[PDB]
Symmetry: C5
Subunit: 205 residues, 5 copies
């Protein structure tokens, strides 16, 4: 679209994706949620889980807003994530780099709401010893900004989803939990939030 | 080519590959087809299919058209996909990133008709438990735009081809189905069209 | 050289590697030949060959020619392949991306005749069932331009031999064939030339 | 911040990441600590350890300092490591390239103090023969600047915490040591500082 | 370094890394040596060696020299290899791409002497059948410029070090040889020199 074209030239003009879009004394609040789609495998020897997650991440980038009157038809845009600031979310218990399965694009509202919803396959460190028991194995997968404290990036949880879980596969879900936390670290003087996704699973039969 | 050199400079001038080439209240209709070339392997433990396919994809980019009078000989061009807008097609049941086996180039017509025909090797999540049975295993491989709804990107099926299927290999094809749908998500108004490629296969030696 | 440095500045000035260097109603004729250096492995289950090839591709780019009088010493130069137009040759039966083992450089004449001679390791789909037989297994490895027809890119064979073949290794060569063909597709009024490298091999003893 | 863009624009237009930020006859002192998070696996045949480390690297880069008057709110910034000079630390006994698990960003103070804290998964050459013994296997993992001598880059150790060690897993820690040294090479006559991380571990039971 | 920053600006000014730094009809002499650090594994089926080498490559790039009077403190600089011309050395018997383990930097003197000393892990084609014998298996690993002949790049060998060989590991060294040769090819008027590293090893008792 010619109205869409005219906007991308502006949404680029003075945009630096390395800059966290904080506004005078206010953190960027980032909404976060993980959905376990499939437990691919477990390594009982090496103590690891091979898992496929759907991530729901949303925030506001004030540098990404536009007047819908200036660009009529343009309600939303699909922007490549490389073109924009994305939260520096770390998987604290990941033992492999993330494999992003879905197109690396984000949707952007006229008010600057960024929605990045990737499917990630990753391997995590976990005590899988009790996978063959009724109690099952429990993985506490922790995620959070690696470099931004609470006053810069406010991590918040959003409504989760266990409808996406693959019905076939050796593993059945005993329980799933998501909890947001905040702690002070001896290092920093400033606090840091995190979201912990907790899974309890077991081998079927 | 000489006019070809002059055209590539212009076909770049004001082109943004991140912009969907929709024209005033009309979606971009993308034609899509998938041809199963070979089922590489199955993981009965992990419930996965390793598959090779030929993707037939095409659309009209109204920003890519040119006057053949301005560029005589130039009927078509081989453009790298990275230089142009391509549909953001997601493999909904993929459990590995796609491995593109062919050159990453697209053929473009004087009227903006782009044809991207890659060979992809990818691993998908599938219930392969019945692979050793006469009924066989069935994989419902779903594909569609990740960010564009039906009124921005109109996914359409084109006539598919099962002549490309490798005659050797452990697996024989019981049946192949192609269906286009429009799914509504709780998230949003406006539906999301998808093409589901359904395969029924079985081990040749299952006796 | 101080002419070589100036030559590279000019050989870049108005050069687009995305443009096929066809000149007025004439296709670019590309000379091609494969030499099987080693059959690494066979997967009898998955029906695949892991092979190491030496490719000899050579063509003439008219935009790359220069006056030797303008650049005295400069007879030839080593240009990175990424800097120049290379034929879009596809391995039709490849089931893995090519692993290029040699430096990614091509040699270029004062008349613009380019020579690209890489060693590639690639995995191909092949009926390897008869590898343990006296008749042996036969692989018909097809190669050709993915996007250019006969009137744009004229694929031509160069006679290759089998002197490069590794003498050790489980596999002995029963026969090697190379044939150039021209195929028509329902799509296109103009045909697509290809070179098929055919191997017949068997496990030793 | 509005000044964050100002900051990133100038600390891009004038900063050369290739330049070691030494200031006149004074080396850059780099603080270094390694924390063993998990021993993933051991290869008794090939004599290798697959390990997950948390690295703590800090130094002062004088080219990255600013007064707060220059960038009002701006106290710190998350800069991509590719934008900065980072110590050229080599893992002398690594037999695989490092897999960096965390976002590749570093924190910079207004007084030029850089903090790079990556989680790395890497495979190292080690004599793992005694892993099944009470004495256990000992890995002497050596790290240091590959190209900078003592008078350019002053490697210094910091206090390492073994609090991060994964409680589950086949391997228990008998002992962990860190020693900084300065070696002489026949090449140079200026010494090369290094930190050797020594682990003694054994299979549980 | 204030002068260092001033030096990197000039060392960039008109530098093209694609250009071999030959001076008016004189070849660039490159010093080369290889040091076997460890034989990782052998594949008796596929006929391959997995090896870790330390490479010592040195050459003089006349475009890289500077007056030490113009830049006081600056005796040497660590430049990323990507920023400068490096010899296009091919591993003629490599069946995998090289895995470079060490930082990809080279040291450069005030007189243009470049020293690139990487640790490479690579897999080579080799007749490993006799690895379990007293005679042992012999690998003739050939290396040389892929595109430059004797009059452009003069390959020379330097001091061979076997002190770096890992004492643990299944394999003991029977013998190591390095020889430089000047091969003539039917293709070309000018000879192509090469260095062949020959190893004889065997499985320990
Ligand atoms: C990085 N770290 C905080 C800062 C910080 O620790 C730190 C900062 C500066 C100096 C020393 C330590 C910032 C937010 C994430 C948090 C992560 C957690 O600590 C951690 C460290 C090591 C492995 C796993 C997890
Ligand atoms: C991505 N999603 C739709 C939008 C949306 O979900 C959504 C949008 C905005 C907010 C929250 C959720 C767009 C069309 C595709 C669909 C995909 C499906 O989720 C999905 C998730 C995981 C595996 C397979 C498929
Ligand atoms: C890509 N295709 C031709 C063009 C074309 O078909 C086509 C063009 C335009 C529209 C529809 C179809 C050009 C020459 C190569 C050929 C490729 C071969 O089919 C093929 C595809 C997949 C695996 C093996 C072989
Ligand atoms: C690279 N070397 C020193 C430099 C140097 O030797 C050297 C420098 C210049 C010329 C010749 C040799 C500097 C600091 C690292 C040290 C490491 C060791 O060599 C080495 C090489 C390969 C594997 C393990 C260890
Ligand atoms: C590449 N080749 C020479 C050039 C040349 O032969 C050649 C040149 C032009 C046309 C045909 C052949 C240059 C120096 C190295 C030599 C390498 C060897 O061929 C070779 C090829 C494949 C695997 C291992 C070795
Ligand atoms: C102008 C506009 O449409 N703004 C919407 C906002 O009301 C909504 O809460 C947000 C998240 O979905 O997306 C944006
Ligand atoms: C993400 C976000 O900011 N959501 C809010 C929400 O309170 C409201 O229901 C919605 C609809 O206008 O838009 C705004
Ligand atoms: C000018 C020209 O050749 N236009 C063609 C058009 O007629 C055809 O339907 C389309 C798809 O093949 O390709 C384009
Ligand atoms: C893909 C497309 O747009 N096809 C149409 C079709 O109606 C017609 O038969 C063809 C030939 O001119 O060109 C146009
Ligand atoms: C100026 C010059 O040397 N031109 C040569 C040409 O005569 C030769 O046939 C071709 C292929 O080798 O390389 C070029
Ligand atoms: C590749 C090519 O074009 N070769 C031709 C060939 O007929 C001739 O023998 C050679 C020497 O001048 O140059 C020209
Ligand atoms: C201006 C400022 O905040 N400077 C601090 C300094 O006091 C501290 O020792 C160093 C390491 O944490 O970081 C810097
Ligand atoms: C890294 C560094 O320089 N640290 C010092 C340290 O002595 C002091 O405790 C700190 C707090 O002001 O800042 C300064
Ligand atoms: C100006 C200067 O230091 N030049 C030295 C030279 O004498 C030495 O042989 C060479 C290799 O180490 O490095 C350079
Ligand atoms: C690499 C090189 O050119 N080396 C030479 C060497 O003959 C000499 O001993 C050294 C010390 O000045 O510098 C020069
Ligand atoms: O690994 C993750 N982030 C680190 C960056 C590595 O390039 C990550 C974040 C989330 Br949410 C997942 Br699941 N993985
Ligand atoms: O995986 C696919 N797209 C996502 C790319 C991001 O990693 C994909 C699309 C189609 Br059609 C296939 Br087959 N795979
Ligand atoms: O795979 C090949 N070419 C296309 C690009 C793949 O990503 C290829 C061509 C030849 Br000749 C060989 Br051998 N492989
Ligand atoms: O593989 C080598 N060079 C080719 C470049 C990558 O495609 C190589 C050179 C040396 Br010395 C070794 Br050891 N490997
Ligand atoms: O491998 C490491 N550095 C060099 C990479 C160049 O390719 C490395 C450094 C440290 Br500290 C660890 Br743990 N690994």
């Amino acid at each position: 679209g010619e109205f869409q074209r005219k906007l991308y030239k502006e949404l680029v003009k003075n945009y630096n994706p390395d800059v966290i879009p904080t506004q005078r004394d206010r953190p960027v609040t980032v909404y976060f949620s993980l959905s376990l789609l499939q437990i691919m495998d477990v390594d009982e020897k090496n103590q690891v889980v091979d898992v496929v997650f759907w991530l729901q991440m949303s925030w506001t980038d004030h540098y990404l807003q536009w007047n819908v009157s200036e660009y009529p038809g343009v309600k939303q845009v699909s922007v490549p994530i490389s073109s924009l600031w994305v939260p520096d979310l770390a998987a604290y218990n990941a033992i492999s780099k993330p494999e992003v399965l879905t197109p690396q694009l984000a949707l952007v509202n006229s008010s600057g709401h960024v929605q990045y919803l990737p499917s990630i396959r990753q391997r995590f460190s976990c005590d899988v010893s009790g996978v063959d028991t009724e109690s099952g194995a429990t993985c506490k997968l922790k995620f959070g900004s690696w470099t931004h404290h609470s006053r810069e990036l406010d991590l918040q949880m959003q409504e989760a989803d266990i409808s996406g879980y693959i019905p076939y596969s050796r593993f059945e879900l005993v329980g799933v939990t998501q909890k947001r936390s905040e702690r002070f670290y001896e290092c920093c003087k400033e606090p840091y939030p995190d979201v912990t996704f907790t899974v309890t699973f077991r081998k079927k039969g």
